[PDB]
């Protein structure tokens, strides 16, 4: 590339294509006809190269439309869930000081492989429903098997979180394990700085993973960081309430991935 | 004689609404130098003592609706058909705001289809008088309500134009005359007028914080005066007063507030618009539109109870106008049934009621819960990749109308959902906006609403779905398949519209016309009863009784009856055996001895004094099962 300006502004132009009249695309979906017509210069082969140089931006969908995960709507939709009881959902938080550049578009791109049950071709496939948005994703195989991986903001906390919610079932545990493994792979390969074990921090890293539990349904969720649940699963298999040593919850429902459940 | 009407003012987001009314009312003070945009509807009433030979001193009330789009969800409650409607140009932005009027005029047509509308320019000091061209070109008599007169008052100050506008208002109010009735000067009993007088007098003797009045207080006031009303006169008297806007009372049994009476309507209307104006610019932990119980003397519960009753609570207004991208599992042009409801504009209170009708229906395919994501114009309640329903809202390319695309799977569990959502939308549309689904034999038969069904012969890869009007497709009931000009390939009717054919019902009620022999034309097989619509026939080799329906019973009503009849199944109740089209019939068991009344009339000796006990036992068993099914028989 002898002209960096041309490349940078081509990427900018693909990131800023807008069409009047509110067409049938939800924000973040573009059609090849729209992008070709939007650029005032209707080139013939450079258009093909431009649609082919998006190995960096615009994933192909159905060979006629393009997804742009960096231009999707940033308004979190009002989304409900089948189950809402504290004993029917497993919630895993990923507290971070900030979201790195490109984090929420890499996570979506990684999460667009469809085989958490087909096991990479052991079974054919199981296509779920999807509700893409710039800060989250929702996958739905059944009212018993689903996954919601989306950003969350807490009261009086300047940090950012990655609340993952799955049903408290066997398929929910499978989805939680798969999603946690993929997110850990993404954090290891592309953003090692958040996983960097600072010696000056004395065993403290920018990323802190919490599991939310509730001894009695209806009460507020309590947070335990996973670096303690690992030892508590090394000792036993149950988590005990210090105030009342009778309310015991297994580690098969707060974090099944720790005990290979 | 009764002399009282409603002069409603209509317009958008800042115009001569609260300014024009001041000189229209000739309010000299105008103390507020800079007033704010209206919150609520700002009910007011002003008499017009006409200084002419006629002395009808009519008093009429103006409801100048708020123009901001955030209050648009509650306006269609107060759009009655006994009123005169105004409109305001804001002629400063000429040739542009006239187009902006069109949603308001369309809503007026949808709600009050037979009321005149008067358009009023509210700017002369600024600018652009070519707007009257477009008002005479496309806004005059094209689907829009019956425009009567148009004016161009300066609004800021009184003038000859304003006087002409006032005279025009007088003439149109005194010549309302819907279906030749002359409403403005109709005759009513004096008891209604006396009740109105005492109500408007007592309006000033109620607490400001809570003018709501119980029915006990009303029965007290009727006792204190000398009215001649009884328990049988109040349900019509208060309804007539409500139609005149003196006090708002609601007669819907489902919304449990009919005990309360809302005198001083402006207070209720202002309270209704308080929740729509509160916000929070802090931490967005909740998505835009959802809200929970957050902040006097026990009034807090009544507030959101009233909001839920009006279905304003989750706030359907200001609810995530941008929709997130949805990627359905099977979209190969053959597993999805799609239907469209092309209409020129979306009526004001359409989506906030629609997404509040399908929302509360959790027991679909019957109790499991559906995932759901709400936006300002959609629901998309989905259970699984093989069971879902997407009620969207898009605009087609090179199309100025507004569409309601419902997408459903074509499998077993999809027909039920499609028929259950189509029924709800049709019921809402005919219950809230009767002016839309109104036939127009005069002129072209547009009907404003064209319900299309989408079908493609090719099993996928058709690249486009052919439209088909639902009425033209309905008239094609002679056969069971649809086919193009090249009839080598064809599509079953069930796959593209399983609500016209009785497919969303359980399949054990199939008509099975092949094995049914039945002679409708002769009357000697009509012998069941006397001069009834039930005939005797044979189905499946067994004697049965069929019930031919006349043209009165619509398909939707018949389906709504069958869906509840099919799930009853008791040995003491007549059980359905089949139902179908060509003609709209209904097969049931044949009672060999006929009804009991004929036997009591002519065969009084046949009862062996212990059959009189068996009949009672069987009827008691039937009544017990019916009352166990939470249905009341009401006519035995
Ligand atoms: N399955 C049946 N077997 C025998 N007789 C029947 C059966 N169903 C109805 N009948 C009788 O046939 C007649 C039908 O009466 P029906 O219920 O149609 O009356 P209706 O609703 O008042 O009238 P319509 O609908 O014609 O205005 C009655 O005399 C009834 O007893
Ligand atoms: N300059 C000018 N201003 C006007 C005229 N008519 C109305 N206005 C302004 O419009 C405002 C009226 O607000 P209004 O539309 O009634 O509030 P809304 O009903 O909630 O939209 C007033 O504050 C006036 O200043 C006019 O003829 N000339």
Numbering used by the authors:
A (entry chain C): 1597 to 1652, 1658 to 1862
B (entry chain E): 1331 to 1457, 1463 to 1630, 1642 to 1659, 1668 to 1720, 1726 to 1995
Question: Which sentences did the original study use to describe this structure?
Answer:
Mutations in the LRRK2 gene, which encodes the leucine-rich repeat kinase 2 (LRRK2) protein, are among the most frequent genetic causes of late-onset PD and account for ~5% of familial and ~1% of sporadic cases. Most LRRK2-related PD mutations, such as G2019S (Gly2019→Ser), have increased kinase activity. Previous studies have suggested an emerging “Rab29–LRRK2–Rabs” cascade for LRRK2 signaling, in which GTP-bound Rab29 (Rab29•GTP) facilitates LRRK2 membrane recruitment and activation, then activated LRRK2 phosphorylates Rab GTPases, including Rab29 itself.
